[PDB]
Structures are given as structure tokens and as C-alpha cells.
């Protein structure tokens, strides 16, 4: 179930029917690889199989050494976080004396364990690879004596397979300064992640959401290289917690709304700037202005609250009544009437202005509509492509009904002579305020110019009195003939 | 040693104690792989091992051909560079006649050599892999005769190991249009880079810094696929030169400062826009507005001067006195009182407005502070999380002392009736200027408006004489009878 509404009056469109999945918190897991402590590789061997092992064994030593050296529109309104602050803090605790020993003792007879850190944090732990056991129990006989009791290739192959993962984890970390995202399948296989999720301290609905979307979980995760000490390699994997699920979501698409006068320099424009994703959340609305920070999987939308504003639920009113008295809808103003299109969920908004050729075509029919100047819309039903100027847009073909809501474009409600066209970070009320002020100064100045153009200049400066008659000064004496007798 | 100061007066905070590492220049090295020139692969053999050798051998040839096709807030104030202009220039010289022979001859008896190019630039050169030697001394005996000497399986594995580096280097370049960054360990191993750094014409201080931070060096380097000619594969590796080390750095954090009147349409806001990294540099201050372009390692901060402005040292004054007469502090204005937080080095700034719930919590205790409307701050000692609306922020847990510097929020010093709220790219003096200008225009206009009722209008034009009495015109006729 997906529907869409286009508002002709404000050159915008809302796509709804979406369901939320918001990362609200972080869970930190500790992934460990048990290492072998292999100094010198005592051998006089010049046998091919042992030779392969020394180049491969060297890759193992180099990786350890290498890892050791390693550890020695309205988006501008968003706050600024520290994405791996929680993971780093847990990693910091692992560096405290005695701390690694707690973890190491815990994981001897099981690969999965919960460990409480010295600061009280209880973390899930995972031994994902035991290289200590493998080298010390298999290849140790050829490597710990000068005298070298040789090795065979099916064992060699097995060693290359097991060691390779260590090399890739090191590789990833080496070019990411110890912090990677998304978390790759070398860092954490699909099964490993799934069992991690299952053993996580979260509700069942959350477990289901994450398991059916593990690929999204990976992209919102971090792998943090943490410590190598006492033959234990440990990196912190920081996983998303989705504390908001299945609330309604909608996407607001907006496009410039301009007047359509013939003269190219006489037009004025208006654009809703509050486009982005909106989700109901805990009695308020979480607003994600940069919709590219969200990933959509069918009708489920994954976002990160780190990229949201928290708005009053009255923000929805800009959709139904942009002049509503309860929320000050944000807009920008300009005179830049260039043509473009916004491809929506179920159609396309077309802002076609000036002399631009703007059309919509069907697969088999070809061009079926030529847009006139103004802001308009077409549904994805029977339309396959849209062209605006030299730009071709393919429309989204998902099923769903669209509703075209007719109304006079509000840009027509403004008198261009007092319209503030250089407002970038503006809103309805702010624009209204300036228009009232411009109108105020025209009431007053016209009253002033009227009253002044009404006033008479000085009368002559001679020993004679003057009275006013027929628009000029006349001598008083003129009118006194007859007072005698 | 890291400390932090919050300025209540301007809703901003400075974190100090950092040490600089600025990329000021570029060094270009030439990395080479010696190649084998192998046309046809003569064998009618249908043995699994030779078959494996032939499929793997094809991967080598394909890689060469593929590589052959290949070579035929205030950030907007920043200038515009050409990041690999220097590297590209060195690569261009390598295409010149006679030039590869110079390099190839130079690396005849060593893997490391300084080579002067035809334009006089002396570059370090590195033969990192000799596949020519391997195929001609290992495989030439099995592939160069009908009667085919067709060994054991350990050689198949072995060819894969030597060939793998070439395949991965080729793999990287094909999806990056011949220019990659960061420089991977396939392009340049850890040992290779370290010895490159060691053989570089730089000071010991620089050598120490680069060797102890190779993971950062890789991220600030470029690998530029350059040329395949005469069995030589060569790519230029463009390495950062750090000419500024161990100068003081500080990070300026800012957040919106708004009035807090009850009426929602009555509030005004202002935000310092000059947030980013600052480093003392040569008597001036290097300013990096997009702090994501800098990488911090403990108390060392790695930046690129390509992403900086050079400012007068008086720029520091915006921190102590934002109305100081020596530097015009940059700000933006609005009426958009939305809530948010900025996580600093050692705490958190909270801009809490309207009806938003804003709190701070502890690990074991839970919510310990509820913020009132306004701009405020908490240090990371004893605080673990901050919540603003539906957004949870984990704070940084690094050690260091914070100082809360009290002062009246300056947005309160402005009269909202003449406050310019549609300033996006503004500053203190410009805003002051418009208020002076707005005040000028109401004084002058009210002076004008006062001149309404006091002057006398025209009398009627009906051919009758009029005199003035009690503020209006009266017929003269009235008084003569």
C-alpha cells in the first residue's frame, strides 16, 4: 500500500504508506581472533611445501606487526554527533590494565560470552577465528626446532584459507585508519552477524527486522580496530539499535513555483524548502531533510536519528494549508526561474518555465504530453519518461494510486512589487512580515506625499497683509473697499 | 593534554591542546613492476596442471591489455586546486621518448634508485615486482617447446602468489579510472612505503611523523596509473609532504543561539559560522572550515592546507570578545528555533528550544539533567548520553578538564524589530551595519511623518477670499458685516 498526493497550489507532493525503521541507539560487540605467538621460523628447509608455508607464515607475522603499528536542503540545521563515540569508549576500556584478561578468560570453552567491563558495561563477545590453536597444534612441529619435520600441501591450502581472513581484516583497517563502514563479510560473516543479532538484548520484533535486512544493518555498522595484546586480536563492531519500528513515514518532494510572465526578468518564484523524509515518532515528527541519508527497502525506510530534526506534529499542516496559523512553513524566494523535474515515488513534478521544452512520453506511443509553463505533475501510470530541456528522467514504476489536488499556485497571491526575492533561509511568516512592512511604508509615504503636495508656499514679504483666493496670495486691502461708511 | 572552554555568550566552544600535521606539499615517486612479454602459449597439453597454468597465465595477459587500455560551513570560501597536478606532470614526462629507458637502466642493479628525469626533477624509483624474471626463469622451461616438461601442483599455487599482486593492482585501477586514494597495500606495501619515506628528501621530524602514522599517510596519498611500455608497468605514487608539524591546533564548535520568548513568531537566532579546525601557522592562522577534511589521531591532527584559509591571528579574538574591533567575526541569522546538540571534544552543547524535551543521562543513574530553553553545555565527566527530541547522542569519553565561561547570550542584546533574520553568509559588522541602516531609515522617516499636521493646505478655489482661523480656512466675507 503506497499512495501519493500532488499539491498544485504549492508545487509539492507527498508520498505516503511507508513504514519506519529508525536507528536510535548503538550496541557494541567485541569480535576477537585468537592469535599465535610465533617469533622465529627455524628451518633449513628448501622443500616446496614448507617454502609455501614460510611465505604464508610471513604474511601472518606481517599482518600482526602491521596491525600493531596501527594502534600505536535544511541539513545545515542538524546537530553534530560522534558516530563511534560509544564504540571507542568500549575500546578505551579494553586498554585498561586487567581488562583484556577478563575477556580472554571468559572465551576459552565457548565462542560466545557476555562480559561486564570495569565501568559496568556488559558486552557480547565472539571468538570468530582461533589462529592460536591452529598454528600451535598443527604447524608448530615444523617451526619450533631448527630441525624441521616437514609439511604437506592439503594442509598448506587449509592454512591459506584460515589465514586469509586475518589478512583482509588487516587490509581493510590499513586503508581506513582502523575504522570501517559498511562492515564487510570478512569482518563478520552473515551467519556470525545473525547469531550475534539473535543473542542481542532486544525484543523479538527488532530481531526479525534486523534479520530480514542484514544488508542494511551492515551499512549502519562500524568496525573499530581496538587492541592487540597477549595473542588476542580484538576489534569492536558497533551495531545499530532500531528503537522505532512500523510508524508511518512519508516523503515530501518539492519544486520551484514561479509566475509565468513572458518577460524572463519579470518572474518571481517560491519553493518549499522543507522537503525530505518525515516519520511519526513518540508524539512528534522526526524530519530527515537530506533524504539520501535514508535507505528504502520496499515500503520500509531505514533512517538514522542522528540525521533528523524533532518537530511538532503540526509540521504536517504545511501539506494541507501552507498559510495555517499553527506552523510557520519554510520556503525560499528567488527570481531564478529555471526548469527542472522532481521524480517522485509515483510520478513526476515538472517545473517548466521560460522557453524550455518539457515533455512526457510513453514507451510505445512516444511523446504524449507537452507541459505548459508552470508547475505541474504527471503520474507514473501510462508514463515512462519525462524530458525537461536536455535532461531525460526515467520515472519510478512502482504500483500505487496518485491524487492530483488542484488549487491556484500561491505565487499568484503575491504582489511582485513588494515581494522579497532574495530570501534563501526564509518562511511564510517571515515573508509576510516583510510584505506588511513594505505595504506599511507605502501607506505612510503616500499619505505624506499627498499632504505635502497639498501645502502652499510663503506669501510676499512686504509691508502688506495677504489673504488666500483662487490659489494665490491676494492683498487684504483689495477686499476692504466699502467698510466706509 | 586536552582542555575545553564553552562560551555561554556566543553558544560556542573551543577544544585545545592539539598538535598539527599539515600537508603543505607533494612528493612524487615512481613505482614499477617489471613485466614479461609473452605472446603465444605453446602446448597441446591437456594436463590439469598445465591447464591451470594456462588459465592463470591468461589472467596475466588480460591484466596487461586491460592496463594498456587504461593509459590511452564556510567551505564555499575555499579556493580550488588540482590535487594530482604535480603527480600527473611526472607521469607525462615518463611518456617522453627515451625516458622509460632511463628508469629501466637506472634500476638495472638496484630496486631503489634516484633518477633524474629529462626536465631535471629527481624522483625516487622502485621496482617492486619482477614478473619478467619469474616467468622466464620458472615457466619458460615448461611453455617453450612441444615436448612439455609438466611439473607438480606446488608451482601452480606459486604462480598465483606472485601474479596476485599484479592482478589486484590492475583490479583497483580499472574501477577508479587510473587514480586511487587511499593508496592500498597492493599499490604499496607497508615496508615499501616506510622505506620510501626513509629515502625521501625530508627532515628527521617529518620522517618520524610519517613512519609512526602510515595509515594516515596512505589516506593523503594518490596512486596514479601512468604507463606500460617496454615490459615496464609504472604508476606514480603521490605522497604528502608535512611541512608543518607540532604547532598548536584548536577546534571551534558552534550551535544556534536564539531568544526564548513564549510567542513562537517572536524569536530571533544567530549562529557563529566560523566553526572548524584552527592551527597556528607562520604568524597567521590556518582555518579548516570543513572539519571532516581533517583526521585526528590522539592529540595530533592531520589536515591539508588545500582545504584552508589563511587568517590574521586576530581571528582568535572572536572567542574572547565577539564585538572586538580588530576582527569581524562571521555569523548567520534566522528565526528558525529548532533544537539540536553539538558533541564537542570534551562535552556537549545543547541548543534546546520550544517544546522539545532535552536531557542528559548517566550510565547507571539515568536522566540526571533536564535542559531549559536556551544554549547550554555539559562536560563529559559523569555524563554519558544526551537526548534532544528523538535524537540520542553518545558523548566522547576522552579525559580533560572543561571550563564553563558564563556571560549573557548576545542575541539578547538585539532589538528584534530591526534584527536582520534573513542573513545567511553574514558577520558581526554587517549585521550591525544594517541595524544602523534600519535605524537611520526610521528616524529619518519619522522626522518626515511628523511634518503632516503643521503646515497650511490650499484654500478653496471658488473665487472667494479666505483667511485662516482655528486651523482652517474661513471666508473673508464672514468678518465684514
Amino acid at each position: 500500500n503506497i499512495t501519493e498526493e500532488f499539491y498544485q497550489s504549492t508545487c509539492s507532493a507527498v508520498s505516503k504508506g511507508y513504514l519506519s525503521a529508525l536507528r536510535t541507539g548503538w550496541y557494541t560487540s567485541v569480535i576477537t581472533i585468537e592469535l599465535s605467538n610465533i617469533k622465529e621460523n627455524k628451518c633449513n628447509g628448501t622443500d616446496a611445501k614448507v617454502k609455501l608455508i614460510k611465505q604464508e607464515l610471513d604474511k601472518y607475522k606481517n599482518a600482526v606487526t602491521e596491525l600493531q603499528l596501527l594502534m600505536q536542503f535544511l541539513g545545515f540545521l542538524l546537530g553534530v554527533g560522534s558516530a563511534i563515540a560509544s564504540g571507542v569508549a568500549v575500546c578505551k576500556v579494553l586498554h585498561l590494565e586487567g581488562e583484556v584478561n577478563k575477556i580472554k578468560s571468559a572465551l576459552l570453552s565457548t565462542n560466545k560470552a557476555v562480559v561486564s567491563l570495569s565501568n559496568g558495561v556488559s558486552v557480547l563477545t565472539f571468538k570468530v577465528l582461533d589462529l592460536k590453536n591452529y598454528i600451535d597444534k598443527q604447524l608448530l612441529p615444523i617451526l619450533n626446532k631448527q630441525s624441521c619435520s616437514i609439511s604437506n600441501i592439503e594442509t598448506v591450502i587449509e592454512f591459506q584459507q584460515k589465514n586469509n581472513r586475518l589478512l583482509e581484516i588487516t587490509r581493510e583497517f590499513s586503508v581506513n585508519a582502523g575504522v570501517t563502514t559498511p562492515v564487510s563479510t570478512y569482518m563478520l560473516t552473515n551467519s556470525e552477524l545473525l547469531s550475534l543479532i539473535n543473542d542481542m538484548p532486544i525484543t523479538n520484533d527488532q530481531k526479525k527486522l534486523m534479520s530480514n535486512n542484514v544488508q542494511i544493518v551492515r551499512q549502519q555498522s562500524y568496525s573499530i580496530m581496538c587492541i592487540i595484546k597477549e595473542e588476542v586480536l580484538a576489534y569492536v563492531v558497533q551495531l545499530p539499535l532500531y528503537g522505532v519500528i512500523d510508524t508511518p513515514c512519508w516523503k515530501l518532494h518539492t519544486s520551484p513555483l514561479c509566475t509565468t510572465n513572458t518577460k524572463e526578468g519579470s518572474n518571481i518564484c517560491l519553493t518549499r524548502t522543507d522537503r525530505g523524509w518525515y516519520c511519526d515518532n513518540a508524539g512528534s515528527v522526526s524530519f530527515f531533510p537530506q533524504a539520501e541519508t535514508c535507505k528504502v527497502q520496499s515500503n520500509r525506510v531505514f533512517c538514522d536519528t542522528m540525521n533528523s530534526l524533532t518537530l511538532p506534529s503540526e509540521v504536517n499542516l504545511c501539506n494541507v494549508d501552507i498559510f495555517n496559523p499553527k506552523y510557520d512553513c519554510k520556503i525560499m524566494t528567488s527570481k531564478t526561474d529555471v526548469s527542472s523535474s522532481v521524480i517522485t515515488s509515483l510520478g513526476a513534478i515538472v517545473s517548466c518555465y521560460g522557453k524550455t521544452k518539457c515533455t512526457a512520453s510513453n514507451k510505445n506511443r512516444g511523446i504524449i504530453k507537452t507541459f505548459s509553463n508552470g508547475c505541474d505533475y504527471v503520474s507514473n501510470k501510462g508514463v515512462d519518461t519525462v524530458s525537461v530541456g536536455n535532461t531525460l528522467y526515467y520515472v519510478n514504476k512502482q504500483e500505487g494510486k496518485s491524487l492530483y489536488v488542484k488549487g491556484e499556485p500561491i505565487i499568484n497571491f503575491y504582489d511582485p512589487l513588494v515581494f522579497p526575492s532574495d530570501e534563501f533561509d526564509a518562511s511564510i511568516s517571515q515573508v509576510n512580515e516583510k510584505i506588511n512592512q513594505s505595504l506599511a511604508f507605502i501607506r505612510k509615504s503616500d499619505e505624506l506625499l499627498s499632504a505635502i503636495g497639498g501645502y502652499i508656499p510663503e506669501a510676499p514679504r512686504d509691508g502688506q497683509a495677504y489673504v488666500r483666493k483662487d490659489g494665490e496670495w491676494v492683498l487684504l486691502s483689495t477686499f476692504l473697499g466699502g467698510l466706509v461708511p | 593534554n586536552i582542555t575545553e572552554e564553552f562560551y555561554q555568550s556566543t553558544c560556542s566552544a573551543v577544544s585545545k591542546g592539539y598538535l598539527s600535521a599539515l600537508r603543505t606539499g607533494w612528493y612524487t615517486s615512481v613505482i614499477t613492476i617489471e613485466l614479461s612479454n609473452i605472446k603465444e602459449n605453446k602446448c597441446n597439453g591437456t594436463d590439469a596442471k598445465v591447464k591451470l597454468i594456462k588459465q592463470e597465465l591468461d589472467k596475466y595477459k588480460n591484466a596487461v591489455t586491460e592496463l594498456q587500455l587504461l593509459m590511452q560551513f564556510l567551505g564555499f570560501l575555499l579556493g580550488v586546486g588540482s590535487a594530482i597536478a604535480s603527480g600527473v606532470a611526472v607521469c607525462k614526462v615518463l611518456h617522453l621518448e627515451g625516458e622509460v629507458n632511463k628508469i629501466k637502466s637506472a634500476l638495472l642493479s638496484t630496486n631503489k634508485a634516484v633518477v633524474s628525469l629529462s626536465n631535471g626533477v629527481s624522483v625516487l624509483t622502485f621496482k617492486v615486482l619482477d614478473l619478467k624474471n619469474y616467468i622466464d626463469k620458472q615457466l619458460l622451461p615448461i611453455l617453450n617447446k612441444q615436448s612439455c616438461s609438466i611439473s607438480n601442483i606446488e608451482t601452480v599455487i606459486e604462480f598465483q602468489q606472485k601474479n596476485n599482486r599484479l592482478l589486484e593492482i590492475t583490479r583497483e585501477f580499472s574501477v577508479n579510472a587510473g587514480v586511487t586514494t587511499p593508496v592500498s597495500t597492493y599499490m604499496l606495501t607497508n615496508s615499501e612505503l616506510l622505506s620510501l619515506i626513509n629515502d625521501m628528501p625530508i627532515t628527521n621530524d617529518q620522517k618520524k611523523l610519517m613512519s609512526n602514522n602510515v595509515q594516515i599517510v596512505r589516506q593523503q596519498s594518490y596512486s596514479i596509473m601512468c604507463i606500460i611500455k617496454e615490459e615496464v608497468l609504472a604508476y606514480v605514487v603521490q605522497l604528502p609532504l608535512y611541512g608543518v608539524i607540532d604547532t598548536p591546533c584548536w577546534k571551534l564548535h558552534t550551535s544556534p543561539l536564539c531568544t526564548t520568548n513564549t510567542k513562537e513568531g517572536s524569536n530571533i537566532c544567530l549562529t557563529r559560522t566560523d566553526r572548524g579546525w584552527y592551527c597556528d601557522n607562520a604568524g597567521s592562522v590556518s582555518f579548516f572550515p570543513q572539519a571532516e577534511t581533517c583526521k585526528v589521531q590522539s592529540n595530533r591532527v592531520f589536515c591539508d592546507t588545500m582545504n584552508s584559509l589563511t587568517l590574521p591571528s586576530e581571528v582568535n579574538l572572536c572567542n574572547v570578545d565577539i564585538f572586538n574591533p580588530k576582527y569581524d567575526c562571521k555569523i548567520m541569522t534566522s528565526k528558525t528555533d529548532v533544537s539540536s546538540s553539538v558533541i564537542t571534544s570534551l562535552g556537549a552543547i545543547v541548543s534546546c528550544y520550544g517544546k522539545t524535551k532535552c536531557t542528559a543521562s548517566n550510565k547507571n543513574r539515568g536522566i540526571i539533567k533536564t535542559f531549559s530553553n536556551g544554549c547550554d553545555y555539559v562536560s563529559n565527566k559523569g555524563v554519558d548520553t544526551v537526548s534532544v527530541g528523538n535524537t540520542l547522542y553518545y558523548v566522547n569519553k576522552q579525559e580533560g578538564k572543561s571550563l564553563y565561561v558564563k556571560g549573557e547570550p548576545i542575541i539578547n542584546f538585539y532589538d528584534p524589530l530591526v534584527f536582520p533574520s534573513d542573513e545567511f553568509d553574514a558577520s558581526i559588522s554587517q549585521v550591525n551595519e544594517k541595524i544602523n541602516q534600519s535605524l537611520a531609515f526610521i528616524r529619518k522617516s519619522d522626522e518626515l511623518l511628523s511634518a503632516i499636521g503643521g503646515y497650511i493646505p490650499e484654500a478653496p478655489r471658488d473665487g472667494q477670499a479666505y483667511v485662516r482661523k482655528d486651523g482652517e480656512w474661513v471666508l473673508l466675507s464672514t468678518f465684514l458685516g
Partner: nanobody
Amino acid sequence: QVQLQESGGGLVQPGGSLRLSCAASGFTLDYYYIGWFRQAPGKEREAVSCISGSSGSTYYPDSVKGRFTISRDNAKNTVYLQMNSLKPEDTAVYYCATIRSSSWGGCVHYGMDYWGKGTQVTV
């Protein structure tokens, strides 16, 4: 405004059952996650049961899963933890806690925003 009040604590014999109640005042449940926690003497405090205010979805750690069940009654604005087949090792002080789902960070004691003062259960 926000307050939590646990009740139903008392001395129980092993194998017996007991129900605790947690009355919420000052906020609405729908927007929150409700958890039951316990801290036995000398031991660190541990999670026991979480529920979603919205979906009613629940989380039980392995140790009590099957024996403990959490439910909510919207009309009475109260969250209940039913405990079956109680063992002496369950002797602890049981705390009620909650956190806004917006700030949700797992069913963990370091992930709660408000805490009741507790009620003692002894088996």
C-alpha cells in the same frame, strides 16, 4: 512528573509464583520501552524483561525465558511481570525502569532513563 512505583515484593518459597506491578505516572507508555531489572545482593544489576509500548513485543533473557512473562494493561497504565517456578537464585531487588523509544539502546541497565526505587523479593 515522571514516577515509577513497584509493588508485590515479599518472601516466597522455592517453586512458588509471584506477580510484580509497576505503576507509571507522568508519561505515556506508548512512546517508551518498559523493562524489569533485578540486582541480587553484592552482584551487578541485570536485565530481566523488556516490552515495547507500541507493538507489545517482548524480550526475555535466556535464564528466565519460559518462566517469566511480561504483559501490559493499557487501561490501568501498569506493567506486570509474572514469574513462574521461582528459584532461590532469583532472590534480588527488582527495579522497574523505562526509556523513550527515541533513545532506545537495548534492554540494558545502562540504557534506562527512569528508575523506580524497587521492591524486595526473597525466595
